[PDB]
Amino acid sequence: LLKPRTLADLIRILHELFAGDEVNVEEVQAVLEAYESNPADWALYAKFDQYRYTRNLVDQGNGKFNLMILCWGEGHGSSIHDHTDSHCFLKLLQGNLKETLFDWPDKKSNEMIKKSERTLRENQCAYINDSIGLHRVENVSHTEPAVSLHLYSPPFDTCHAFDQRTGHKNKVTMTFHSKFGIRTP
């Protein structure tokens, strides 16, 4: 377990950690957090959109994980979502994001109430899965875009969004804005 000097070193260390069948969550998280964000490494991937956050595939981890870069303009946020029974790691490359944690609702139609909120700041790494709960991620800054590195294992194409007033959920299909530095409409 060595320090990733560059995003390309990190990706090679991640391939080594996902060699087996099972995941060492704490080791993944330590090494993601040890990579010092350098914009020259991931410039190619930071493709923003005026209206919402963009998802930009970086590496597909020999089928074991998706590594992607999320770009969040001012005020861009996600909905309340689960992660499809996968692991989710989230490292901040630039700016800050607010994360809000929710519990799985009851089949009762009811407002969903926050368990907790917190700020994720530059270079920190957060971890979530469905057994911890639901969450919402947002760039609440009026001035500064945010960029995060995201790692999901196993990969998933879809997830569920939750309406905060009802807890009712809807299945959603992930879109890539770009793959490997190349935009894809």
**83 known member of a binding site:** yes
Going through the chain in order, the beta strands assigned E by DSSP cover: 54-59, 66-72, 80-81, 87-94, 97-102, 114-120, 125-128, 134-138, 146-153, 158-162, 169-173, 178-179, 182-183
> In whole angstroms, what is the distance from residue 102 CA to residue 127 CA?
14
Pairing of strands 54-59, 178-179: parallel
CB atoms within 10 A of CB 117: 12
Six-digit token pair at 3? 């320090």
Torsional sign, CA 19, 22, 23, 24: negative
The Cα-based distances of 42 to 45, 65, 91 in angstroms read: 5, 18, 13
Six-digit token pair at 171? 């299945």
**81 known member of a binding site:** yes
**160 known member of a binding site:** no
Going by C-alpha positions, the residue among 17, 15, 13, 68 that lies closest to residue 42 is 68
Which residue ranges are tagged as binding site for Fe cation? 81, 83, 135
Which residue ranges are tagged as binding site? 81, 83, 135
